[PDB]
Swiss-Prot record, chain A:
Binding site for ATP: 281-288
Entire protein: shown range: 13 to 462 of 1038
Domain Helicase ATP-binding stretches: 268-413
Protein name: Type I restriction enzyme EcoR124I/EcoR124II endonuclease subunit
Subunit structure: A monomer in solution. The type I restriction/modification system is composed of three polypeptides R, M and S; the restriction enzyme has stoichiometry R(2)M(2)S(1) while the methyltransferase is M(2)S(1). There is an equilibrium between R(2)M(2)S(1) and R(1)M(2)S(1); the latter is methylation and translocation proficient but restriction deficient.
Similarity field: Belongs to the HsdR family.
Top-level taxon in the UniProt lineage: Bacteria
Role played: The restriction (R) subunit of a type I restriction enzyme that recognizes 5'-GAAN(6)RTCG-3' (for EcoR124I) and 5'-GAAN(7)RTCG-3' (for EcoR124II) and cleaves a random distance away. Subunit R is required for both nuclease and ATPase activities, but not for modification. After locating an unmethylated recognition site, the enzyme complex serves as a molecular motor that translocates DNA in an ATP-dependent manner until a collision occurs that triggers cleavage. The enzyme undergoes major structural changes to bring the motor domains into contact with DNA, allowing DNA translocation.
Annotated stretches, region: Motor 1 domain: 224-436
Free-text note regarding domains: The individual domains assume different positions in the enzyme, allowing the holoenzyme to regulate the methylase, endonuclease and translocation states. Deletion of the linkers between the domains prevents movement and thus restriction activity.
Miscellaneous information on this protein: Type I restriction and modification enzymes are complex, multifunctional systems which require ATP, S-adenosyl methionine and magnesium as cofactors and, in addition to their endonucleolytic and methylase activities, are potent DNA-dependent ATPases.
Motif (DEAH box): 382-385
Region (Nuclease domain): 19-223
Curated annotation (Swiss-Prot), chain C:
Positions spanned in the full protein: 52 to 152 of 404
Domains as described in the record: Contains two DNA recognition domains (TRD), each specifying recognition of one of the two defined components of the target sequence.
Additional information: Type I restriction and modification enzymes are complex, multifunctional systems which require ATP, S-adenosyl methionine and Mg(2+) as cofactors and, in addition to their endonucleolytic and methylase activities, are potent DNA-dependent ATPases.
Protein name: Type I restriction enzyme EcoR124I/EcoR124II specificity subunit
Region (Target-recognition domain 1): 1-101
Organism: Escherichia coli
Protein family: Belongs to the type-I restriction system S methylase family.
Oligomer and partners: The type I restriction/modification system is composed of three polypeptides R, M and S; the restriction enzyme has stoichiometry R(2)M(2)S(1) while the methyltransferase is M(2)S(1). There is an equilibrium between R(2)M(2)S(1) and R(1)M(2)S(1); the latter is methylation and translocation proficient but restriction deficient. (Microbial infection) Holoenenzyme interacts with Escherichia phage T7 protein Ocr; this interaction leads to the inhibition of the restriction activity, but may still allow methylation and translocation.
Curated annotation (Swiss-Prot), chain D:
EC nos: 2.1.1.72
Annotated disulfide bonds: none
Family affiliation: Belongs to the N(4)/N(6)-methyltransferase family.
Reaction catalyzed: a 2'-deoxyadenosine in DNA + S-adenosyl-L-methionine = an N(6)-methyl-2'-deoxyadenosine in DNA + S-adenosyl-L-homocysteine + H(+)
Protein name from the UniProt record: Type I restriction enzyme EcoR124I/EcoR124II methylase subunit
TM segment ranges: none
Pfam families documented for this protein: HsdM_N (PF12161), N6_Mtase (PF02384)
Domains (record comment): The C-terminus is required for assembly of the restriction enzyme complex. The individual domains assume different positions in the enzyme, allowing the holoenzyme to regulate the methylase, endonuclease and translocation states.
SUPFAM superfamilies on file: S-adenosyl-L-methionine-dependent methyltransferases
Record text on subunit structure and interactions: The type I restriction/modification system is composed of three polypeptides R, M and S; the restriction enzyme has stoichiometry R(2)M(2)S(1) while the methyltransferase is M(2)S(1). There is an equilibrium between R(2)M(2)S(1) and R(1)M(2)S(1); the latter is methylation and translocation proficient but restriction deficient.
Keywords: DNA-binding, Methyltransferase, Plasmid, Restriction system, S-adenosyl-L-methionine, Transferase
Note: Type I restriction and modification enzymes are complex, multifunctional systems which require ATP, S-adenosyl methionine and Mg(2+) as cofactors and, in addition to their endonucleolytic and methylase activities, are potent DNA-dependent ATPases.
Length: 436, 163, 101, 427, 104, 52
């Protein structure tokens, strides 16, 4: 079901003392084979390339000759004039290429089955050609770098102590650096002291508790669905260009939200308070970012028709829109009024609609049963029922029926700053996930 | 058209959310009876507006009626394109300075029509011989007027800010 | 150019036609073509109109001449420039203070 | 409404580049919707607004005998609309190739070659094609006013306006219900052959509206042009390539009425790089045309393919003026008999992206026996922009002038053949 | 400006900022950003600069706050590829006399 | 590169003159050779177009 589970799996070492970078790696590989990964021995370059036309036969289910494979390798796979940035774009955006056969039919060569992640075949390899390294290579392409260190290599100098042809290793995206007592991980950004332990992440338990060891780290994050959802569903390739990785508790609460959708939709229930729920991420969230990811996953999640992430306004609507055209492609604003907003409810392909609560109230005081009424629609509020109580909520329970009523909030019921609105417990149901 | 959601700074987090929409003219005591009070005077929390322009989060209501009277002062085709016209300018009294200085073209719809108007019917050169009738580069004439003149392409026509 | 393209319907088109001696300025970007608005005339598309406020002194065929008393700065049309300050402000030698009589 | 849907095309689908590039995509989606509606209408002769995959080859051969495009079981635009906004692009690339398999008989195919595409990324291509298919899908098209949209869309700003084409047709037509019509050399569009069917909806088609044309995209749009007007499969086809190099059919046949619109002074290098001195169409000329024109190759080609009731209505820039002794003996061989009969000049402009006055040559193997010119300079109704249009019954005035050899003042008339040989063969 | 070019090194000395269309006047603001007193800098602009109203007057006034601009030179239409307008050459150094220059 | 007709192979004008186009050692100044490296449309219509 989930990715981050509430129960915590056991922690063990694989030692084979970690001062040597050649022994416990083998036990790690054998644990991955116990997780169902496949160690092959290609300590070379060209045959590894042929491994790609090994995998894609399995992947897209179609057959190359040699010449079209040279065309695909030259023109799309291993364009030599390109760096890590556009190749990262090919990871997260341009992961499909059209191709014309000698039969002259156009077929869409994929790279990752982002629909059925279980279809995607994985492999694991290790050191060759320097240092002693571990490489997780999925569907032919190498993705995850793993380097163990000594006990002497401190967590601050995990990066601060250590740091064509071949150009095939340019596809490497994640720098998962370990030492024996800790493991951190980050994107394709290698600044010296700013991207140290502060900007990298330890893995954590279900709610808050961080992880230090290795084999438990393996049994958590190196799972099949887990590592793929890391690589696909929770990777934010900002068009800075900068890849961003979400916090683990962010991903966990997102999983709680989407699984709540999955559970309530198959139970064909709507409009209950306990069908809702809310998140106390008042700080350390990137509530913009986490809301964007949850919203886009709702849009692709296809149970529904519309996702209304609504807020109240004090330079918020222009702000987060500006935050989300950073997250480049698609978001319909609530500009400028409830005139063409109905055209926006008519419109799709730009599915996420963001507006003020007061524009919505200008639609909900009147306007007499909009055609998106009895449709499956998810209302992602912000500043939950401790900061919304009135005409929105009462005409929400009055008018609207098939709403999935969620919301991030920095405002649950506090003793400190609860001068916003009414209760949340019998209105939005129960609290779901929180962070200090 | 031109209505604001303004209340209240009491319970600053948009608690005591009252007062739906206020078309102009807008009074202190009218909104005050709409909202009561927040035991003191901290109100007109500007958070939402149907306005054809850009307004600020703490603009006083007398200034709001001032802006509305400047809107109602202007002709309605200019009231429709205040958003486009204010791009060149910065305020409305500024716009009220050169409100005489706007050339309106419902007749002209692109730059080509502007060139054909200012050449043919204006008669900026006189003779149009039949040997020369086709042979007036309206495209380059529009490029040169675009270099010189301040032009704005709108829905209802083309507006020339001539000084 | 010349002061005559032919007739039009004067009924219900707001054509001014009635002071029997105004003047004009043609052109925008030329500022040299001068005509006395003689009899009953339209407002056709570039006729930036000039008459007087004080109609006791001016006798504006006077000032119709007084434009072309200076052709050396007034009546030279060269580029794409409007000259509102140039014909608006100053100066003109006037036999004021024999005004108006 | 006609101009309302024309306005819908003039706004909605026009996005987001120059129209000559997305034109192919728009017209392809339009044509696919047409085949969808036509095939769905035909299979009802019982509620296929949604189909069923029950394809019977002994029954599906009957469209291949009859319409020669079995679309699919369930791969039409009405059935695309459910799967519209979904992965992926090349289902239309498949559903081009499959109905264009259809080898039985007389393929008239290799045809939907538009979408390749650009495009910059695959999701961008998918969203753009979804937008185009929705915008074509989001139209109000009833069932017969479908080609009018194609008439407007081909009449973008950038082509032989309809009254001029109508004038060519009425020049091509009087006292005539006689198989065959028509042949066209250098057809360009079929927009001038559109009025041929408006004439031939009256009695009947006679044979195929035979054209040959050079530019391959123009070739494809012309073939779908005369496909869209409910024109039957069997006869109506166009050959690709130059007519000056390789005309076909040479054997088939001496024709009875022919029209044209040749290009403007397009060159050709064949004099005499092959033995075109000793061909069948340039040999009675005695000389060949220079490289700075092509028009007389068309007209000798024309009078080659011509019957007793054969007439040739061709257009010209005034490069047929006198232009020297070789062009004299061209003109002389024309006035050797009553080959050329009347000429008609028009007034500038009347044409897109063009200036000059044009000329209309009328040719027949039929006695007169003199040249009776039928020429005005005005009118030539030059009020609507620009010399537009030769209005309805303004053209009938000109046809009435054409009718029986009239001699109207401030208008042209007969000349003597002795006068025009006493003249130096002028117009 | 929507970014911190509202409060950059060159448009905060400008006071009012470059509009959506006439941002040619930003470039001389850029040109003084890359400038020393001895070495002189020659730019050109199409002649839509008289001082272009109060939207650019202070800009012009900033340029005559000191002699940031030194000299101007006019030209003849065409003397280009089909303009047919002149331009205005603006030569900028902080090498002052000081006197206004109209040596055109 | 410029001699004949009917050779092998096709592709000489977009991609794979890589050792002058990339040329990382040193002072490389990329997008340096964005004109003609290796591809390529036909057999020696293409490469005899190059030849002639």
């Amino acid at each position: 079901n989930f990715i981050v589970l509430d129960k915590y799996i056991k922690a063990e070492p694989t030692g084979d003392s970690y001062q040597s970078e050649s022994d416990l790696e083998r036990e790690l590989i054998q644990d991955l084979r116990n997780q169902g990964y496949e160690f092959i021995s290609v300590k070379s370059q060209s045959a590894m390339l042929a491994n790609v036309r090994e995998q894609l036969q399995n992947l897209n289910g179609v057959v190359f000759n040699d010449s079209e494979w040279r065309r695909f390798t030259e023109q799309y796979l291993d364009n030599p004039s390109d760096g890590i940035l556009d190749k990262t774009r090919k990871i997260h955006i341009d992961y499909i290429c059209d191709f014309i056969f000698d039969d002259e039919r156009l077929e869409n060569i994929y790279l990752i089955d982002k629909k059925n992640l279980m279809r995607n075949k994985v492999q694991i390899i290790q050191q060759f050609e320097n240092r002693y390294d571990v490489t997780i290579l999925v569907n032919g392409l190498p993705l995850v770098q793993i380097e163990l260190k000594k006990r002497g290599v401190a967590i601050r100098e995990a990066f601060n102590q250590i740091h064509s042809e071949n150009s095939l290793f340019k596809y490497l995206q994640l720098f998962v650096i370990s030492n024996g007592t800790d493991t951190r991980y980050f994107a394709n950004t290698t600044k010296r002291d700013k991207n140290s332990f502060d900007f990298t992440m330890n893995w954590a338990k279900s709610d808050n508790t961080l992880i230090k060891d290795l084999k438990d780290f393996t049994a958590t994050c190196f799972q099949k669905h887990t590592l793929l959802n890391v690589l696909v569903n929770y990777s934010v390739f900002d068009s800075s260009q900068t890849l961003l990785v979400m916090r683990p508790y962010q991903i966990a609460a997102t999983e709680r939200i989407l699984w709540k959708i999955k559970s309530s939709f198959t139970a064909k229930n709507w409009s209950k308070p306990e069908s809702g729920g809310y998140i106390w991420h008042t700080t350390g969230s990137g509530k913009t970012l986490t809301s964007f990811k949850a919203a886009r996953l709702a849009t692709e999640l296809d149970f529904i028709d519309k996702v209304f992430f609504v807020v109240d306004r004090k330079d918020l609507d222009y702000q987060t829109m500006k935050e989300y055209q950073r997250f480049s492609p698609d978001s319909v604003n609530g500009s400028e009024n409830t005139a063409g907003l109905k055209r926006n409810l008519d419109k799709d392909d730009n599915k996420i609609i963001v507006t003020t609560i007061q524009k919505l109230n200008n639609l909900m005081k009147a306007e007499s049963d909009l055609p998106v009424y009895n449709q499956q629609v998810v209302f992602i509020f912000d500043e939950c029922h401790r900061s919304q109580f009135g005409e929105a909520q009462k005409n929400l329970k009055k008018k609207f029926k098939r709403y999935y009523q969620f919301g991030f909030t920095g405002t649950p019921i506090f003793p400190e700053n609860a001068l916003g609105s009414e209760t949340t417990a019998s209105v939005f149901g129960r609290e779901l996930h929180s962070y200090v | 058209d031109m209505q604001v959601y303004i209340a209240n700074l009491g319970k600053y987090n948009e608690g005591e959310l009252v007062g739906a929409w206020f078309t102009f003219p807008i009074d202190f005591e009218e909104v005050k009876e709409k909202i009561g009070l927040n035991d003191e005077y901290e109100e007109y929390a500007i958070h939402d507006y149907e306005l054809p322009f850009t307004v600020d989060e703490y603009t006083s209501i007398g200034e709001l009626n001032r802006l509305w009277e400047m809107v109602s002062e202007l002709p309605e085709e200019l009231q429709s394109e205040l958003s486009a016209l204010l791009t060149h300018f910065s305020s409305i009294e500024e716009l009220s300075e050169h409100q005489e200085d706007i050339i309106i073209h419902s007749d002209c719809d692109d730059m080509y029509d502007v060139a054909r108007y200012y050449i043919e019917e204006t008669g900026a050169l006189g003779e149009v011989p039949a040997s020369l009738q086709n042979y007036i580069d309206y495209q380059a004439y529009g490029r040169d007027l675009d270099l010189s003149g301040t032009f704005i392409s709108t829905n209802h026509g083309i507006f020339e800010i001539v000084y | 150019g010349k002061t005559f393209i032919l007739g039009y319907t004067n009924e219900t088109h707001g054509i001014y036609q009635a002071s029997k001696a105004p003047v004009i300025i043609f052109d925008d970007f030329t500022t040299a073509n001068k005509w006395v608005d003689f009899d009953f005339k339209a407002k056709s598309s570039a006729m930036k109109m000039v008459t007087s406020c004080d109609d006791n002194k001016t006798l504006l065929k006077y000032v119709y001449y007084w434009l072309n008393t200076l052709p050396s700065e007034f009546a030279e049309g060269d580029h794409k420039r409007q000259w509102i300050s140039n014909y608006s402000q100053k100066k003109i030698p006037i036999p004021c203070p024999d005004n108006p009589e | 409404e006609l101009h309302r849907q024309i306005w819908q095309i003039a706004n909605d689908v026009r996005g987001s580049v120059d129209g000559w590039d997305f034109k192919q995509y728009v017209l392809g989606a339009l044509f696919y919707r047409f085949i969808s509606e036509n095939f769905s209408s035909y299979i009802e002769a019982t509620d296929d607004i949604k189909d069923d995959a029950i394809k019977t080859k002994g029954y599906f051969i009957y469209p291949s005998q009859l319409f020669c495009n079995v679309a699919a079981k369930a791969n039409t635009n009405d059935r695309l609309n459910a799967d519209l906004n979904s992965i992926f692009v090349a289902i239309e690339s498949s559903a081009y190739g499959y109905p264009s398999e259809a080898d039985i008989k007389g393929l008239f195919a290799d045809f939907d070659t538009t979408s390749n595409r650009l495009g910059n990324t695959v999701k961008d291509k998918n969203a753009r094609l979804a937008a185009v298919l929705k915008g074509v899908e989001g139209l109000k098209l009833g069932i017969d006013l479908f080609g009018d949209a194609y008439e407007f869309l081909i009449s973008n700003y950038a082509f032989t306006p309809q009254h001029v084409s109508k004038l060519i047709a009425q020049l091509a037509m009087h006292g005539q219900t006689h198989v065959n019509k028509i042949y066209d050399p250098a057809a360009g569009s079929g927009s001038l052959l559109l009025q041929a069917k408006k004439q031939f909806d009256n009695h009947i088609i006679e044979e195929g509206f035979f054209g040959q044309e050079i530019n391959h995209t123009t070739y494809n749009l012309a073939r779908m042009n005369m496909f869209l007007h409910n024109i039957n499969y069997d006869k109506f086809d166009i050959k690709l390539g130059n007519t000056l190099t390789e005309p076909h059919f040479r054997d088939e046949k001496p024709f009875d009425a022919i029209v044209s619109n040749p290009p403007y002074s397009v060159k050709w290098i064949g004099s005499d790089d092959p033995t075109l001195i000793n061909d069948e169409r340039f040999a009675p000329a005695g000389v060949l045309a220079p490289k700075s024109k092509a028009d007389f190759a068309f007209v000798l080609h024309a009078l080659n393919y011509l019957s007793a009731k054969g007439r040739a209505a061709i257009v010209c820039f005034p490069g047929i003026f006198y232009r020297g002794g070789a062009e004299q003996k061209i003109r002389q061989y024309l006035v050797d008999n009553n080959y050329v009969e009347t000429v008609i000049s028009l007034a500038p402009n009347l044409f897109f992206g063009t200036t000059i006055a044009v000329n209309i040559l009328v040719l027949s193997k039929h006695k007169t026996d003199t040249n009776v010119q039928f020429i005005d300079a005005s009118e030539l109704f030059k009020k609507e922009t620009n010399n537009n249009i030769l209005t309805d019954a303004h053209i009938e005035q000109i046809m009435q002038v054409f009718a029986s050899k009239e001699d109207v003042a401030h208008l042209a008339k007969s000349v003597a053949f002795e006068t025009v040989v006493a003249n130096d063969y002028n117009l």
